[PDB]
Symmetry: D2
Subunit: 304 residues, 4 copies
Amino acid sequence: TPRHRGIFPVVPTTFADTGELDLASQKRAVDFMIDAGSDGLCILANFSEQFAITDDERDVLTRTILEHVAGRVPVIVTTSHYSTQVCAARSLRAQQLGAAMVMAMPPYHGATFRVPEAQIFEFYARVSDAIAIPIMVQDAPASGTALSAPFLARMAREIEQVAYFKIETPGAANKLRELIRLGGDAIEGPWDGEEAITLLADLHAGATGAMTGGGFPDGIRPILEAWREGRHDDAYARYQAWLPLINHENRQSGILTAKALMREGGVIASERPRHPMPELHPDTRAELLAIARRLDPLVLRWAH
Amino acid sequence: TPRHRGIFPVVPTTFADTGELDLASQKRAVDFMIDAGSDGLCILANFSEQFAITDDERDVLTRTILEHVAGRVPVIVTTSHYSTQVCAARSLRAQQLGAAMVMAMPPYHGATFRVPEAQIFEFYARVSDAIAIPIMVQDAPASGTALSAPFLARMAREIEQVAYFKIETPGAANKLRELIRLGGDAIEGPWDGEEAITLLADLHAGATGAMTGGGFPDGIRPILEAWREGRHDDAYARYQAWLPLINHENRQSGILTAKALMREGGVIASERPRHPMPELHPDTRAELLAIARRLDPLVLRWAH
Amino acid sequence: TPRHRGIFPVVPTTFADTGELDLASQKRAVDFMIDAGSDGLCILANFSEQFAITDDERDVLTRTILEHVAGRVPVIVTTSHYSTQVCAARSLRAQQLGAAMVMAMPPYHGATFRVPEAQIFEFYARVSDAIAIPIMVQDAPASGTALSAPFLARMAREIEQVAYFKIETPGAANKLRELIRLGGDAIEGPWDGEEAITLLADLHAGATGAMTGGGFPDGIRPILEAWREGRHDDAYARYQAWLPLINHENRQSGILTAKALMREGGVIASERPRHPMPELHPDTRAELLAIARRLDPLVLRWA
Amino acid sequence: TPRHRGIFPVVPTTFADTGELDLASQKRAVDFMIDAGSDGLCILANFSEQFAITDDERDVLTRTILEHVAGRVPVIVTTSHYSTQVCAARSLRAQQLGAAMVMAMPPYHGATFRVPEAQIFEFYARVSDAIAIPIMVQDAPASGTALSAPFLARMAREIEQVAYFKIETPGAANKLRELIRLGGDAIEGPWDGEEAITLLADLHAGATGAMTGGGFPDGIRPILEAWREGRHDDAYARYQAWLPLINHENRQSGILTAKALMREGGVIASERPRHPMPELHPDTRAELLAIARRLDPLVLRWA
């Protein structure tokens, strides 16, 4: 019934050691993530370090990744901007390059620039008017913006392209419950995020998709498959086995988790963030790899 | 002693009602602000709605304004970006177009992405390494980032281009006092902002420059002139006369103040912000103009 | 129509230099504030350093101040607490001690403990059930809690004692406009706060009362009187003359403004806050007194 | 060398169906937590719903719990208050009633009242001067106050009783590493919190104690025992087994987790919070118990 479901991991942005885009590693990262079983990919999100790249780089990356994916899986392009017209233009460009969906935070800037509900509604309505592909509303702490379940459901019911949701604020499971109740069939994609840290609770609440980190979608996807098939005990057992790694990503190694794994595995040439984002503490990295090696993820045995 | 002192108002970004850049009104605003007596200008700051424009637009505005100013007054170009290399590249481009100085917030994104002191220091150090013009550190609530007076003084002493400071966090006067005490001659420009709302206290604290709104620099500049000449009572009397307008800008009409005054005066064609930023409440606008008309500001009698 | 209007300044809590309550100074501060023309008083609010005192001290101060006022002016007692039952009990105690009104923030704690709208409604509904005097809902940044104009108006319409509001979040004037419109005759008291810094805009918006600092209500009250009488230009003139002092209180000397002035004038024995609240920088204090002397407020010539 | 180490779970506050304190259930919860093997107990913290109780209730709970513990295990009494003198008085009273240690957040109030580093130092220095038992500094999001590792280490080196730390801000493991590096043997207790969600990473970083929720200390303590004995694989296996329950507590059922489990097990009479704190969603509670029953915790087979 929904056009999209399952696991849509966030593609990290691969830099060279000196900070320029490393497009050769970017393509390998994409190929690994498809081989790991991803149902689709999300690019230029926060786990992609989007705040560290330029508009020109955003376009190069969108072109490069969509062309390299070559229709194998659907791609969600994150297009957030404070300006309605800028977001609409980015979203139309992403559509013309082959995106299956765009994702946008509500408009915000920094710690203090926020937008009232009425204008947030207009923002998403005008982005929807400009495109013919679905919009995923991102509900995440980084925007510092409250998007209530009734407001989110109203957008799904009333705005043509608003149909998908990445719910990552605290209490996401019970918010997903309310979103589904109020939105009904207009909620095509009640999805969660935050590296799958709350995936078990969110599946109980009705989530049908998960936007995870890019390092081990092969570890997480069978949880969603087991859940959809009614194999709830198998889903729990898989969640339990992978939860220490999900937890280390969520709390310790963060955005850089996927790149540290891909570098250790020979998928990418450099795991560095763009300065000034702090590099991983060597103990945090060592502990990451120690947990990962217990689980034998594809990322450490793909390039070899 | 210092290379720059006095009033450096923020140039608003002028749009058509449609949201496109209005570069004709943009140049008229610049000419009015120079005619009002500004010692210099600051572009692409938060009162310029910089969060609502693209990289391409940033370059168009920088080139257009610097060319139109044509060396009549120094221009500070705001170049903030999370990425060190992006900020350095923007700052070099601003220099190449004729900027006297760049202003940069510390690296941040949204409500949740913050950078430790050690990496903030490296951020400014690397921007400094790239350019020949001075850096103004912006200390403002929008970044959600704490920059202590000891830390700011250390950057002034240890980083070649860090020499100017826009202090607009709460308690700016006593922060300016401590910055000057700890930094000495390395504090070339202890400046304030926030539309001049705390100008009197900040002058007592030793501020030598003020980054105000663009609607009435002619009202504010004689306060700084009087202060420098030791005419403290003339400064106070002028502050008292203009404080209700400063206060209405700070608390009621905000960013759109300068544009509402400029539109009423025929300086610019449209006072609208870029969507989704809310437009001015009609009563807020009417009360703004009522206060301004008590003060005979140049913006309402600029016959060019 | 309304039971209460005008200026209701916040009474500072007077401590000895040692930190103990100084009740002798507390009573003098109250007497000065009444002599300054206050239409009423508000006690135990944030400008009273309520976060620095104990429950026992709250009760001592409520009893002492209400007895000393002796019905001369109405007193709003601030009773905020996270717990509904504790707030309701404090409010009933305040009523029994002679309060004309209670003020309560929505329930909150610290930076992170917040309460959904539905339970905030139940909080105020249950406090209202316990008492027979009106409630003032405080809409202020300290709570970190969003109270929309429609929600506030719904509480006024549906909860018997909810009838007054202290609006001091950013954009208070236009929130007051919407609250007054949506709430209609249920909005008995649309008031502002924040030391009167936005008073002119808030009066344009329909505010009928102002909860200010306690140092110079005589400076501010004629703005409200002029406004009520239609003398809008006189109101502007008074606002303009006093705005540098209001601005210094709002941005520089803060909570300690009233006590610094009262100590300079000999009204109270000590201007000190309770530790760890920072003491005034000496230049901040000197600049405060320099502005104040120019305006000749009662506090410097009362004792 | 440290005086205290191991697992010190937070004791929930048990209310009756009426919202009054239920001291009979309170004592049973203490007995269960001791029977579960706790090395010590922490009372009146935020996981104890301390923001919902009165000063009188705080004193009754401190007396009741310390007397009931009867010296069986050491008790940390949380004494946070904005006022230095109030915190010091609470801490001295806790000491006189038998507390082994006090825990205090830095002084704060609400979303907006914060204290500069210099006055935070003075706050802890003066509390230390008042008492003869150690202080645990709580580094937690609820205070909205930044306490850098250099500042925490400085307090440990310069303030006699500051010796223990509950680090539960984001990135606690890296912060604990830096605190230990900078403070040396002045850091007697580098501990973590947040229900043990980051316990494995924090143990790698040098944590010697954990302040967890009160529902299943028996599940968590073997992780710390294995770590201290060098059985790092055993620690991982136990952490992995219990992490789904820790995670559900941390993200879904929160403060009420321990009370829901204790009520289900017959330890306490009522699991309600005080109004207006939201009650547990029925699905969240059912899912909590489903996970818990896979792990056979003592709380469901105690009474």
